[PDB]
Design an enzyme around this catalytic site. Structure first.
Site, short mmCIF file in Angstrom:
data_model
loop_
_atom_site.label_atom_id
_atom_site.label_comp_id
_atom_site.label_asym_id
_atom_site.label_seq_id
_atom_site.Cartn_x
_atom_site.Cartn_y
_atom_site.Cartn_z
N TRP A 243 2.21 -37.44 70.91
CA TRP A 243 2.26 -38.13 72.23
C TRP A 243 2.31 -39.61 71.98
O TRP A 243 1.90 -40.01 70.84
CB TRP A 243 1.13 -37.73 73.16
CG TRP A 243 -0.24 -37.97 72.56
CD1 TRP A 243 -0.81 -39.21 72.79
CD2 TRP A 243 -1.15 -37.18 71.78
NE1 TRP A 243 -1.99 -39.19 72.24
CE2 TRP A 243 -2.18 -38.05 71.59
CE3 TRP A 243 -1.31 -35.73 71.25
CZ2 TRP A 243 -3.35 -37.62 70.81
CZ3 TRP A 243 -2.41 -35.36 70.47
CH2 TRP A 243 -3.44 -36.27 70.24
N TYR B 204 -6.84 -28.33 65.28
CA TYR B 204 -6.98 -29.79 65.34
C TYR B 204 -8.04 -30.29 64.35
O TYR B 204 -9.17 -29.98 64.48
CB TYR B 204 -7.43 -30.26 66.69
CG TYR B 204 -7.56 -31.74 66.79
CD1 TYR B 204 -6.44 -32.52 66.95
CD2 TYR B 204 -8.76 -32.37 66.63
CE1 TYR B 204 -6.52 -33.91 66.96
CE2 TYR B 204 -8.85 -33.76 66.55
CZ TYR B 204 -7.73 -34.52 66.75
OH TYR B 204 -7.78 -35.87 66.77
N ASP C 44 -0.98 -35.45 64.76
CA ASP C 44 -2.20 -34.79 64.38
C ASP C 44 -2.07 -34.27 62.95
O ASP C 44 -1.00 -33.89 62.52
CB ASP C 44 -2.51 -33.64 65.30
CG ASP C 44 -2.86 -34.08 66.68
OD1 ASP C 44 -3.17 -35.30 66.86
OD2 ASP C 44 -2.77 -33.21 67.60
N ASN D 168 -2.54 -36.39 76.44
CA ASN D 168 -3.32 -36.27 75.18
C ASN D 168 -4.40 -35.21 75.08
O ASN D 168 -5.19 -35.24 74.16
CB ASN D 168 -3.80 -37.65 74.71
CG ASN D 168 -4.98 -38.20 75.53
OD1 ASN D 168 -5.82 -37.48 76.14
ND2 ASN D 168 -5.11 -39.50 75.46
N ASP D 169 -4.43 -34.22 76.00
CA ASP D 169 -5.34 -33.08 75.88
C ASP D 169 -4.64 -32.01 75.05
O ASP D 169 -5.29 -31.15 74.46
CB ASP D 169 -5.75 -32.48 77.22
CG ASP D 169 -6.47 -33.48 78.10
OD1 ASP D 169 -7.28 -34.23 77.53
OD2 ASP D 169 -6.16 -33.51 79.32
N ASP E 12 -7.01 -39.01 71.40
CA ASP E 12 -7.95 -37.98 71.83
C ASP E 12 -8.36 -37.12 70.68
O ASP E 12 -7.66 -36.24 70.29
CB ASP E 12 -7.28 -37.11 72.93
CG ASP E 12 -8.14 -36.01 73.39
OD1 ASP E 12 -9.35 -36.05 73.03
OD2 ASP E 12 -7.62 -35.13 74.17
N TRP F 28 -1.28 -31.66 69.51
CA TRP F 28 0.09 -32.04 69.03
C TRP F 28 0.19 -31.62 67.58
O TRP F 28 0.44 -32.50 66.73
CB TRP F 28 0.39 -33.53 69.21
CG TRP F 28 0.55 -33.91 70.66
CD1 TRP F 28 -0.18 -34.77 71.44
CD2 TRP F 28 1.53 -33.44 71.50
NE1 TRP F 28 0.27 -34.79 72.71
CE2 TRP F 28 1.34 -34.00 72.77
CE3 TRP F 28 2.58 -32.54 71.26
CZ2 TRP F 28 2.19 -33.66 73.83
CZ3 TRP F 28 3.43 -32.24 72.33
CH2 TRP F 28 3.23 -32.79 73.60
#
Ligand code: HEC
Ligand code: HEC
Ligand code: HEC
Ligand code: HEC
Ligand SMILES: [Ca+2]
Ligand SMILES: [Ca+2]
Ligand code: NA
Ligand code: NA
Ligand code: NA
Ligand code: NA
EC number: 1.4.9.1
Lengths: 354, 125, 376, 125, 376, 355
Positions: D51, D113, D70, D98-99, D26, D102
């Site tokens: 994840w 992100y 990430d 995955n929203d 994601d 991470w």
């Protein structure tokens, strides 16, 4: 009809018989050869004018009567800003209410009362004819009607073509009859894009039919006291000119220090500048605005004195939002504004520009 | 939608980039983010500076001075983007330049660009 | 049929011709009403974001609000304010983090409060409405924290101050029911009721488990605070409804949004806000389409409308666009709002007939979250 | 291109959203902003959290565990955006969700992100 | 034929099959070289922005840098560092303004300096490369201020501190010629030479007026600090050249980039970075197309190339895309870089034949500025 | 050689004749019934082992020999990470170099020297036959040769399938012969997504052929001194266990306090835990890691003592980047991880799991 009324006011306007010792008329202070301002040199230069007594000086500079007829009657608008009226503080509602007050002011024309005015009117056969023809037989025998009638005539006179001809170079360029010089067009461009236009244009937006370069509003631009004028006025150096707050019935303290935005028509020939005549030169008037915008040392210094401007006579209700533009006028822009303002000179005074 | 072709003004829709008053606009039409043709959206701050242009009005055949003023203190609106350049001159003639963020004079020293308004302040010449 | 841009051209032209003056100024947005709709744009994880305030009836942007990284927007049902929990950094996306709540005036859109949250406590996640929530009296804002463990932050909007973090069990989402109570959904398939104070371990009570470990409850349930109704679809369009109006959870009969034959032919819900609930009608709206089972975040092109009491289907609307999120106005003759992340466009539909009435485009980079006030 | 179609993994191009390891990605593929399939781009910070997903590798018929990590501390890259959800579960099963950003354990407390990497950590069970 | 993403999949499949381990890590970009190219995205005036660092040979993004509102990027010709001046706000686009200079390591992309500029002095304007400018030694950064009046800020990169503002006259842009000297372009048509010791007024000296009032010089000329060639096109495609290599200005023959016929039939420069200069080859490159005279900022589909000594045209390329900005690598057999704001894509051409070699898409929202280091 | 050398080492492994007073074999401390660890209670419980003299205690917990033959020989990798070796501080290069050291160490088997060991070997006719068959005649007459051959036989024996059977539930599940319970599965999911995998998986990426749940690196996780063990060892209240920095040849101060990452194979049956045996319960070893991530008061407290974990023995070079994950393990996740680590138990020790 209105022709005759104004023709009567044209007589009264230059008649020193409306002053106690008969030494001055409206035209003595509002000299038609000087765009209806005072040429004479008193104790404080041309900053303030001298009354009928030969000694009393006022505390405010004599303003032009040109274009004063375009100013609306005093009122508070829907945004709660006061607009219009007459005198630098708007204490007179309109031209009619204003006309009587130089006659009775002891520091000016200094007539004792309305009766002394009526008495002087009645001594002239031409006034007996002209007045009775417009207002009726005996009107000069009643002091109240007589004074009111003379105030009407003078107001009508001030509303003729002659006081508001719209024949300046600016007017001719707006009609497409000529063009600004490059410097003049730069100055006009600068005038409508800098902060000037927030105050010295009739409307917020759109185009005005008879522009007089004032929105008729009241603003405190933070001017210092004019020391020699204040001294000559004899009002005492403890005196504070509260501007619009001095109009009876205005109470709101936010109006202290605020004055009517002058029309900039003829500004190039009606020096000295501001309500107290503090600046002899136009360019100095322009440069005063840099004190709120410019970083530089010289922006704190009045070029006429070589010393700091001075603290504001009234250090509150400053129009900071309008004055703190974030941009300083350089010499080239001050130059160009001088040229543009020179184009607001009526035709008949173009010879005065030198 | 030919980009290099002479700009053709219209007087029938203020949200489109060919509306006559937007002849030298750079950014976003405030009418598209909650202002109006001549007013700022809520929560933004109205600058006092402006670049100017003489914009031809096809309707009455007259040319008017549009003094563009920015509404500042928000991120760019992203709605109704336009860049026109009628009579637009380089930065060294700032009065006519439109890459410059005219947010000077805005309340709270706002200098971020949200959108631009298109008021008439005069007749050309 | 005359557009808003055309109407404004026509009026500016009349003003110019009539010589009508008017002062350039900052507009106030119109009074909040039932047909005001907010669209938030998390902008596919960008460091700064926007919320558009839209008049649904006119289909017009009436305002905007800037935010930081993945903010959580809330709207007081009574219309008296809006707020968000937001997050910025001293050098764009790097350096010192500051998490904070802003409350805004709903017509000037000015911040009336800016309240720092100590120790960067926000949950950074693609935006879920019910990870930040207002108590029914509008005095308290509750926000989820995930790291270092599930907790809930209490912010006093009246005193404009952060109060405390609450430790909670292994649960998610925040559905307030009272000035001091909210529910959460737990890994164990229970709800937890959390009754809190200014200090003290909060009273935490679990419901019965209401679903198996292998029914997956979506991240975007609908909750009507006014009705106390929590509407919770699964991946198959099965819908759980929980009635919290009594202050305790009561489990209502499950309904199926799709029929057996639809389900055998691959019909499933999918999107982001895949469900909406209209309180006065007691109606449920679900975004559905034919899709593989693991394409559950893709847009859908259909909404089914079902009676919440009976589960009877009332309509199946063909939306005619790629729709990721839906919601409804809470007035009679409601609008159905259908937001396309892909098109960056809010399509506004008559919720009774499904007909597209108007649309608002240019809504940022990846708009995902529709919020309305239930003012009735 | 049918977005609702069952996703079909390939093992021939890591920048494409159907690359087999991206089955529950994601965000954005780090390879497209100066990272690589398994490394972060310069100036960003590599999270320690992840994840997971079981992704079928069509080169060899095995399913592998991909622990997405990430790269953080920069604004989102804007290149090679992708969103897949093979096996992806809701937030209350966060190891599969995955929203969530991470970015935990990234140097300098970086939580913005930027993009995601796709390393293998195990065979599926 | 094999793309970078495909080659990447083959390598990763071989490592997997061969059981090769490798540690997830932060990459370093490769050594700055002559083919490295920087693309700045002012993002149509968004509050945050991005710079992409690109290997032009492979056509591969090798890094990115975040900036705030309308940053000014600079790149040290020697490849030793890069820097920008940038501007942020405490609440996205509102609140306290901080203007600052950052210097970065050009392979780790880590900031090595963050130097706050007092009193928010930066000129906020759509991005002009020569509004912020490195001295040839790279010890000093010079940035333009427009409010309250034209002035120039002096930032010490070696000492990592702001020094002072210089008063200048009504002039624009900054072209540094030595550690203590830069030229500007003045409203009156002259250039102004500004020499500053550490203190007092700078010594300021004008050239003669070298163009008229009616002749419009673009915002984006090309300046090669190493050759001291200032290359300044006007709106019609006429090109001023000023040599500054002697420390004083000397005006080379004016030259015309388009023929009298081509002007007559609508040919004009237009775009953003309309002009590039290659130093070794002494060769000018000019974005041009058929357009109306007040469409000077729109994209152009053609480039002409001409000798800087003579004026002679060497080539005319059809770029095959809508191009807003151009630049070139400063090595032998240079690349011609052709940036499209609308496609958000950097098209990378052989500068000799104009053929398109490769391209790099998804360069933000509104990419406009190309910078290259002159390292030979 | 292959089978025969391993079989010789099987005999030595169990032979007390390699201890001074002959009370003690490898198998005494590395008990095959307890996953090659020491079940005997000493002055500090099962934390440290008692040597041949019946009195001396070590300072470090006796580790399993299971899966030790999978560890590479000691080296510095190109990252600059030391890797592999034997002993908790890696001071032995490999199994062969390690095997002779408990024979001569006075706190363990306490043989005075190599000749004394050689003398013991010479006295058994089975060793004379087995040794000479593999290493040639008179091998047992040369003390350096005898000692080196014995070390070799012992290393060989630890390399047999007996030591590394890969028959745990985890192995069966990876071959598709059974499946994890939901709890175990959750534990595996957690282990591979949380920080455990940063140190307790062979590889940084990809798939290991024979996973032993360690990367064989050296890390200081900030454990305190185990005071009863440290008092039993007699090394002094002023003594510091420097971990790897104690390997001769390592001078780098950044290696102080770092210890070899143990294999988590059989971890459920090889308590107590860590290099000084400081924690009794597997759960506690797991909860230790929350001291770096949890904000809760309880996370500062060793649940076995009711008191703070304690000051690190070596308060520098902690692996903070790996340890400060920003995420706390809730009780459900600890349970899950306990479940999972239990599946790493070899088949033969499954019966040990009830207790
Ligand atoms: C002795 C000098 C003097 C004489 C005589 C005099 N004035 Fe004035 N006039 C002034 C001064 C000073 C002011 C401003 C005073 C103030 O603002 O309080 C003024 C203000 C005015 C104004 C208002 C202008 C504006 O822009 O606010 C009008 C109208 C006016 N005079 C008309 C007349 C008329 C009509 C006469 C004859 C009756 C007259 N004046 C006689 C000095 C004089
Ligand atoms: C806040 C509104 C405001 C702005 C902006 C403003 N003015 Fe004025 N101006 C006034 C007022 C009020 C006066 C009279 C002040 C007084 O005498 O107390 C004045 C007086 C003047 C005068 C003297 C006129 C006379 O007859 O005495 C000149 C000249 C002038 N302004 C020019 C300018 C120029 C040029 C600008 C743009 C730089 C400017 N002003 C900006 C309000 C404004
Ligand atoms: C008195 C009990 C005792 C005896 C007897 C003993 N050991 Fe050990 N063993 C230990 C202790 C304690 C350690 C850890 C010591 C350290 O790290 O310094 C250890 C460590 C080892 C290691 C290193 C494993 C690792 O993971 O680091 C191997 C291999 C080993 N023993 C094999 C043997 C062999 C072979 C014998 C017989 C030749 C033997 N041991 C005898 C107590 C004993
Ligand atoms: C920094 C790398 C590192 C990380 C991350 C880490 N460990 Fe460890 N683990 C070690 C080291 C080193 C030891 C040996 C410590 C010592 O005795 O000095 C160890 C020892 C253990 C032991 C005791 C083994 C024994 O035989 O005594 C268990 C159980 C354990 N770890 C489990 C875990 C779990 C579960 C996690 C995830 C929460 C984890 N570890 C994270 C490095 C790590
Ligand atoms: Ca005057
Ligand atoms: Ca142990
Ligand atoms: Na004076
Ligand atoms: Na009063
Ligand atoms: Na102990
Ligand atoms: Na050492």
């Amino acid at each position: 009809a209105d022709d005759a009324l104004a023709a009567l006011g044209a007589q009264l306007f230059v008649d020193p018989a409306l002053s106690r010792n008969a030494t001055q008329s409206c035209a003595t202070c509002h000299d038609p050869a000087r765009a209806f301002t005072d040429p004479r040199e008193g104790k404080a230069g041309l900053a303030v004018s001298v009354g009928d007594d030969g000694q009393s000086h006022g505390d405010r500079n004599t303003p032009t009567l040109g274009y004063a007829a375009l100013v609306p009657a005093f009122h508070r608008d829907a945004n709660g800003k006061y607009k219009g009226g007459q005198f630098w503080d708007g204490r007179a509602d309109d031209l009619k209410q204003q006309a009587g007050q130089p006659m009775l002011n002891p520091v000016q024309m200094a007539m004792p009362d309305r009766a002394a005015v009526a008495a002087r009117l009645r001594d002239d056969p031409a006034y007996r004819t002209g007045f009775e023809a417009l207002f009726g037989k005996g009107v000069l025998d009643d002091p109240e009607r007589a004074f009111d009638a003379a105030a009407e005539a003078l107001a009508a006179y001030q509303a003729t073509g002659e006081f508001s001809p719209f024949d300046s170079k600016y007017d001719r360029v707006m009609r497409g009859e000529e063009k600004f010089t490059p410097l003049e067009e730069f100055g006009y461009t600068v005038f409508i894009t800098w902060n000037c236009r927030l105050c010295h244009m009739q409307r917020k937006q759109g185009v005005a039919e008879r522009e007089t370069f004032t929105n008729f509003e009241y603003h405190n631009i933070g001017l210092p006291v004019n020391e020699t004028a204040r001294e000559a006025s004899g009002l005492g150096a403890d005196h504070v000119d509260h501007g619009l707050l001095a109009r009876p019935g205005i109470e709101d303290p936010a109006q202290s220090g605020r004055f009517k935005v002058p029309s900039l028509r003829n500004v190039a020939v009606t020096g000295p500048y501001m309500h107290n005549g503090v600046f002899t030169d136009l360019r100095t008037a322009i440069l005063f605005y840099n004190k709120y915008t410019s970083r530089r040392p010289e922006a704190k210094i009045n070029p006429e004195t070589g010393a700091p401007w001075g603290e504001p006579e009234v250090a509150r209700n400053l129009s900071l939002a309008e004055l703190q533009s974030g941009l300083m006028l350089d010499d080239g822009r001050v130059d160009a504004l001088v040229a543009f303002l020179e184009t607001l000179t009526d035709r008949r005074y173009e010879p005065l520009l030198e | 939608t030919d980009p290099r072709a002479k700009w053709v003004p219209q007087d029938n829709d203020i949200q489109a980039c060919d509306y006559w008053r937007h002849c030298s606009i750079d950014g976003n039409i405030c009418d598209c983010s909650g202002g109006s043709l001549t007013n700022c959206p809520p929560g933004t701050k109205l600058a006092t500076a402006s670049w100017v242009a003489s914009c031809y009005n096809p309707t009455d055949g007259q040319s008017y001075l549009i003094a563009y003023r920015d509404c500042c203190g928000y991120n760019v609106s992203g709605r109704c983007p336009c860049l026109n350049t009628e009579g637009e001159l380089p930065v060294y003639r700032p009065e006519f330049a439109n890459d410059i963020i005219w947010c000077f004079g805005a309340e709270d020293d706002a200098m971020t660009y949200h959108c631009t308004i298109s008021p008439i302040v005069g007749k050309a010449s | 049929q005359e557009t808003q841009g055309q109407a404004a051209a026509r009026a500016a032209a009349a003003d110019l011709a009539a010589g009508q003056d008017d002062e350039p100024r900052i507009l106030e947005a119109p009074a909040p009403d039932a047909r005001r709709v907010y669209v938030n744009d998390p902008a596919h994880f960008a460091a700064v974001t926007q919320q558009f305030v839209i008049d649904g009836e006119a289909g017009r942007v009436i305002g905007m609000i800037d935010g930081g990284f993945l903010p959580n927007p809330v709207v007081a049902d009574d219309g008296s304010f809006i707020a968000h929990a937001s997050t910025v950094f001293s050098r764009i996306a790097r350096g010192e983090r500051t998490d904070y709540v802003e409350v805004f005036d709903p017509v000037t859109l000015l911040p009336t409060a800016d309240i720092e949250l100590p120790d960067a406590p926000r949950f950074l996640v693609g935006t879920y409405p019910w990870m930040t929530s207002l108590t029914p009296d509008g005095k308290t804002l509750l926000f989820y924290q995930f790291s270092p463990a599930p907790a809930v932050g209490v912010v006093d909007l009246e005193g404009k101050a952060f109060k405390r973090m609450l430790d909670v069990p292994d649960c998610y989402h925040i559905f307030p029911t009272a000035p001091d109570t909210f529910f959460m959904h737990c890994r164990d398939g229970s709800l937890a009721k959390v009754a809190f104070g200014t200090e003290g371990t909060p009273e935490i009570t679990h419901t019965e488990v209401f679903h198996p470990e292998d029914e997956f409850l979506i991240n975007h349930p609908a909750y009507s605070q006014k009705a106390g109704r929590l509407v919770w679809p699964t991946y198959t369009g099965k819908i759980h409804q929980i009635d919290l109006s009594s202050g305790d959870a009561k489990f209502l009969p499950a309904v199926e949004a799709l029929t057996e034959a639809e389900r055998a032919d691959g019909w499933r819900p999918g999107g982001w806000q895949q469900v909406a609930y209209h309180r006065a009608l007691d109606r449920i709206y679900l975004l559905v389409d034919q899709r593989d089972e693991w394409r559950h975040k893709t847009a859908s092109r259909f909404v089914v409308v079902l009676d919440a009491k009976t589960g009877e289907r009332l309509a199946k609307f063909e939306m005619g666009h790629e729709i990721d999120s839906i919601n409804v106005s809470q007035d009679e003759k409601p609008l159905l709002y259908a937001l396309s992340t892909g098109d960056k466009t809010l399509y506004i539909h008559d919720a009774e007939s499904g007909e597209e009435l108007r649309s608002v485009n240019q809504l940022g980079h990846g708009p995902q979250v529709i919020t309305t006030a239930d003012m009735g």
